[PDB]
Design a protein around this ligand. Structure first.
Ligand SMILES: OC[C@H]1O[C@H](O)[C@H](O)[C@@H](O)[C@H]1O
Length: 305
């Protein structure tokens, strides 16, 4: 009978789709209805809450399209006697300090990032690239913490592994999608004619994919590119292709956990006024490649690949 909202920034990415799916499950289990809304931008976010209130929802889980909407979201919520839980992306203040006060469930950004970096270097070593003619292209979205911590973690790990600091080139992307990353990567490539082999660093699948698509456009062959995405579920279409590409594999997270856990906690909070922990960090990761993606998806109950 109880209605709880599940707002996501990017409903077109399997990650978010899966979070929805597992929110549904939680609903089934606990006996509550999930109202699934896309909030791609700030306005739609604020409008969506209004709409929720109309429907007579008692709270919502949200991945905000903008961390800096935090204040507004909370205010609107309070006004409607709605409880909020943040998923994925953390609320920040005007000054861009994290709002500790809102319960969050997110991925262990740093740890996953560092695992990306490890695995990048590992595959490089495998291929016997000459470091001298190799480079790292780091496509960044520094304004998003969880993203920041990811790419920084990757760079740290690479630097730690012995990859020359001076051969790591960062480029900000305007959007956390393929088109965005494509533009970014493209602009960086034409600057570095000397490079023969690229490692591509990005916070998620799409970002890395964007990077890869760009390199192919500048006449790099698969052998000469290593990109490892983050998310896993986002990467399935790529890993499924006949031909191997620059996109070598992905770190599979737990969007199932994100969806289910966040919803479950909201309900309890709403229904039973059981205060969720302020911070939940999900540490799950597995490397999925062309060779294993199918197993691992099925293994994690994210069947289909
Ligand atoms: O929490 C994981 C989540 O982090 C951000 O929201 C990214 O945009 C997503 O694609 C995903 O990787």
């Amino acid at each position: 009978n109880l209605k709880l909202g599940f707002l996501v920034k990017q409903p077109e990415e399997p990650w978010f789709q899966t979070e929805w799916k597992f929110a549904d499950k939680a609903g089934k289990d606990l006996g509550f209805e999930v109202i699934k809304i896309a909030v791609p931008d700030g306005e739609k976010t604020l409008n969506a809450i209004d709409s929720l209130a109309a429907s007579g929802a008692k709270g919502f889980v949200i991945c905000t399209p903008d961390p800096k909407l935090g204040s507004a979201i909370v205010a609107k919520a309070r006004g409607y006697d709605m409880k909020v839980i943040a998923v994925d992306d953390q609320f920040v203040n005007a000054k861009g300090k994290p709002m500790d006060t809102v319960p969050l469930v997110m991925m262990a950004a740093t740890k996953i990032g560092e695992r990306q970096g490890q695995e990048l270097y590992k595959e490089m070593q495998k291929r016997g690239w000459d470091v001298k003619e190799s480079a790292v292209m780091a496509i960044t979205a520094n304004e998003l913490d969880t993203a920041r911590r990811r790419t920084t973690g990757s760079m740290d790990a690479l630097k730690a592994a012995g990859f020359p600091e001076k051969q790591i080139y960062q480029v900000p992307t305007k959007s956390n999608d393929i088109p965005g990353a494509f533009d970014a990567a493209n602009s960086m490539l034409v600057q570095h004619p000397e490079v023969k082999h690229w490692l591509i660093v990005g916070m998620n699948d799409s970002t890395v994919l964007g990077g890869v698509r760009a390199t192919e456009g500048q006449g790099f062959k698969a052998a000469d590119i290593i990109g490892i995405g983050i998310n896993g579920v986002d990467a399935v279409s790529e890993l499924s292709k006949a031909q191997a590409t620059g996109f070598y594999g992905s770190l599979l997270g737990s969007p199932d956990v994100h969806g289910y856990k966040s919803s479950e906690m909201l309900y309890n909070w709403v229904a039973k006024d059981v205060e969720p922990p302020k911070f939940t960090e999900v540490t799950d990761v597995v490397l999925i490649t062309r060779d294993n993606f199918k197993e691992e998806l099925e293994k994690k109950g994210l069947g289909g690949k």
